[PDB]
């Protein structure tokens, strides 16, 4: 409370000091139970690559992918990535991976990015102007050069078949004019079943308890619970209004689980004045006391105060009719507030009360009229 106010003195009140959250008990990993190694050695050490006028494409599915072996390979002249970072590729997983495989001149590699245009990139191989994945390339001059005019050049992901047939004199004596093998990995980050995943091992599954979790690369924290939700066979994930994942289909047992965020609330510290006591009582707002002397209010769980059956004027307000005060050998009491002294008016069809005497009150009403006439020289405030 003193650090909330930045003050060594705190007046009688109730201060929203902190945000209580039940912590993740353990970390859960849920991945597809499949173990076949992906064909990257076939992709990168292929007999030949395709010509860029009609580039090869291969689909990678139902397999395990350690991208670290690729990212760590100093043989790659570039490893430029988009919408993912090379270090993160193991942590996360995909419905498919596609490898687009072809040879180009090194001077043209600058055209292979999600926004370019050029005599290759507006023609025979256009990346989507928002693509997600990695471009992996290196000079193959030690193998693909001869020159090797078999290598041939010319909508997003358009294949195609005066005529525009053009070829490269790839010779071992060429450095920008060398042949460069390139593989573009496009990652199908849709919400179907995952089929290409990192070597990250699955754990056992935990339920009804607050955990950190991963499902196919959906990292989060929450209480996993079994659910009645009628997921259709093509849907692996389900979402709330906020686009936050609200449910998941488990990748190994295929049952439908809710995700509920772990119990949380404000930590309102009820205090008498520090100029009166050091003693405090804590309202965990909205939580049930089983989740945290102790007392339960409709406003939350109240700890360190003492419940009282008498009723008094509301000294510090807590909520839902509960109030607190510091009182007699002394404690913070908490009580249902008195609205006032109860009074049956002595009515009848023929009774009247008339005041035989009065008093002159002088009250005191204290109204603001003018706040301070501040003015800010906004250029000097911003630019000094």
């Amino acid at each position: 409370t003193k650090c909330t106010l930045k003050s060594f003195t705190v007046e009688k009140g109730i201060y929203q000091t902190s945000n209580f959250r039940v912590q993740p008990t353990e970390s859960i990993v849920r991945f597809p139970n499949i173990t076949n190694l992906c064909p990257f050695g076939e992709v990168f050490n292929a007999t030949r690559f395709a010509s860029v006028y009609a580039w090869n494409r291969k689909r990678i599915s139902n397999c395990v992918a350690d991208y670290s072996v690729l990212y760590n390979s100093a043989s790659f002249s570039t490893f430029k990535c988009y919408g993912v970072s090379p270090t993160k590729l193991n942590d996360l997983c995909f419905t498919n991976v596609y490898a687009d495989s072809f040879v180009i001149r090194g001077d043209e590699v600058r055209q292979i990015a999600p926004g370019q245009t050029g005599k290759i990139a507006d023609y025979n191989y256009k990346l989507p102007d928002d693509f997600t994945g990695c471009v992996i390339a290196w000079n193959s001059n030690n193998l693909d050069s001869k020159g090797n005019y078999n290598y041939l050049y010319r909508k997003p992901f358009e294949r195609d078949i005066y005529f525009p047939l053009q070829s490269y004199g790839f010779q071992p004596t060429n450095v920008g004019y060398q042949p460069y093998r390139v593989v573009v990995l496009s990652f199908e980050l849709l919400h179907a079943p995952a089929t290409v995943c990192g070597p990250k091992k699955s754990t056992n599954l935990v339920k009804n308890k607050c955990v950190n979790f991963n499902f196919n690369g959906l990292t989060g924290t929450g209480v996993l619970t079994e659910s009645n939700k009628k997921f259709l066979p093509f849907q692996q994930f389900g979402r709330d209004i906020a686009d936050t994942t609200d449910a998941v289909r488990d990748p190994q047992t295929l049952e439908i689980l809710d995700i509920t965020p772990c119990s949380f609330g404000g930590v309102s510290v009820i205090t008498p004045g520090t100029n009166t006591s050091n003693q405090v009582a804590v309202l965990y707002q909205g939580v049930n006391c089983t989740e945290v002397n102790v007392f339960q209010t409709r406003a939350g769980c109240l700890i360190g105060a003492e419940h009282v059956n008498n009723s008094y004027e509301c000294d510090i307000p807590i909520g839902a009719g509960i109030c607190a005060s510091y009182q007699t050998s002394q404690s913070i009491i908490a009580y249902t507030m008195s609205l006032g002294a109860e009074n049956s008016v002595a009515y009848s069809n023929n009774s009247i009360a008339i005041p035989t005497n009065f008093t002159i009150s002088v009250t005191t009403e204290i109204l603001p009229v003018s706040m301070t006439k501040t003015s800010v020289d906004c250029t000097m405030y911003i630019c000094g």
Binding site: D160, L190, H191, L232, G238, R239
Partner: protein
């Protein structure tokens, strides 16, 4: 011939569950109450342009409509998609070997793939190198035409064929009726019920009430 599409031709826009929500989406869709071109299997399968994309359907109890072709020339001057159903499999190809150039079925495989009382429906669309197919099967008592009532199509397959498509055709089998409607870029509003099934939709460009 022509007939009214009514509210038919809506599909699940993405592979994500939602329920009790009015999720808005913008995509290629069949415009509400647009004219569908209509055909009879007996005594009718010309080549049609493909445009943005194609809704397709057939009303059936005999299984005579059995495939589709998509491309620019549809004749192996250049590669073109073939789709066939053979009553044990769905089969898909782009192979160079010559097609039935007056197409009916007698009762370089560089991409190859394998998996009235009924109305069978589809949506076919091409975006950024991927062809996509959606479908629905439903019973009908109204043998006359496409029902004035609602159901939504669900995705079958995504096909990374990379080929340019601007024309299509349909295939018939012999020793039924079929429909065509072009899609357009449209905003749509969708209602997902308490079970996450789409029970209703709005075409946002239909009329000022839908706007």
């Amino acid at each position: 011939a022509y007939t009214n599409s009514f509210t038919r031709g809506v599909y699940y826009p993405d592979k994500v569950f939602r329920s009790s929500v009015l999720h808005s989406t913008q995509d290629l869709f069949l415009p509400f109450f647009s004219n569908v071109t209509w055909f009879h299997a007996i005594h009718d399968n010309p080549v049609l342009p493909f445009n943005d994309g194609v809704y397709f359907a057939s009303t059936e109890k005999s299984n005579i409509i059995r495939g589709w072709i998509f491309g620019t020339t549809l004749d192996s001057k250049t590669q073109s998609l073939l789709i066939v159903n053979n009553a044990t499999n769905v089969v898909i190809k782009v192979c160079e070997f010559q097609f039935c150039n007056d197409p009916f079925l007698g009762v370089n495989c560089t991409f190859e793939y394998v998996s009235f009382k009924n109305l069978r429906e589809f949506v076919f669309k091409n975006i950024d190198g991927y062809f996509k197919i959606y479908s629905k099967h439903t019973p009908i008592n109204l043998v006359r035409d496409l029902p004035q009532g609602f159901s939504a199509l669900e995705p079958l397959v995504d096909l990374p064929i990379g080929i340019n498509i601007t024309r299509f055709q349909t295939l018939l089998a012999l020793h039924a009726a079929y429909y065509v409607g072009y899609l357009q870029p449209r905003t749509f509003l969708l209602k997902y019920n308490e079970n996450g099934t789409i029970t209703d939709a709005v075409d946002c460009a239909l009329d000022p009430l839908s706007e």
